[PDB]
């Protein structure tokens, strides 16, 4: 359901390009590059309504706010 | 944005489009959906990079062996 085709193929290519450029933070690095836009799009979709955003993502409001804070989006 | 080292042309742009296209199609599991979609290829590429060496993959990922093993199992990659 996530295509651009499958989104995962874009992740693979990005990692392939990255490795050709070379680390101990690859997981957080990728997470930041994917969670930030997810948060951006879901909040955009709900017009900034955190409860609706949290419910759509399947996480509680507290976790949503923690992530928004982590990425400096608060 | 945290980094600009992941390009396909930032990777984040591809995530937004997939989400844009997704919304254009109620949902209650978007986080897990996106998490699985990115964790699988990440684990795949990291393991290919370290030629199967789990300890090297975990160190590169910045997680411990147990966590990497748990993720690998979650997607039946072990």
UniProtKB/Swiss-Prot annotation, chain A:
GO CC annotation terms, alphabetical: cytosol; invertasome; nucleoid; nucleosome; protein-DNA complex
Intracellular or extracellular location(s): Cytoplasm, Nucleoid
GO molecular function: core promoter sequence-specific DNA binding; DNA binding; DNA-binding transcription activator activity; DNA-binding transcription repressor activity; protein homodimerization activity; sequence-specific DNA binding; sequence-specific DNA binding, bending; transcription cis-regulatory region binding
Any Pfam family: HTH_8
Keywords annotated in UniProt: Activator, Cytoplasm, DNA-binding, Transcription, Transcription regulation
GO term, biological process aspect, one: chromosome organization
Gene3D superfamilies: Homeodomain-like
Record region (Required for the stimulation of HIN-mediated recombination): 5-22
DNA-binding region: 50-69
Entry keyword Cytoplasm: yes
Domain of life: Bacteria
HAMAP family the record matches: DNA_binding_Fis
Its job: Activates ribosomal RNA transcription, as well other genes. Plays a direct role in upstream activation of rRNA promoters. Binds to a recombinational enhancer sequence that is required to stimulate hin-mediated DNA inversion. Prevents initiation of DNA replication from oriC. Binds to hundreds of transcriptionally active and inactive AT-rich sites, approximately half its binding sites are in non-coding DNA, which only accounts for about 10% of the genome.
SUBUNIT field: Homodimer.
Family: Belongs to the transcriptional regulatory Fis family.
Stated name of the protein: DNA-binding protein Fis
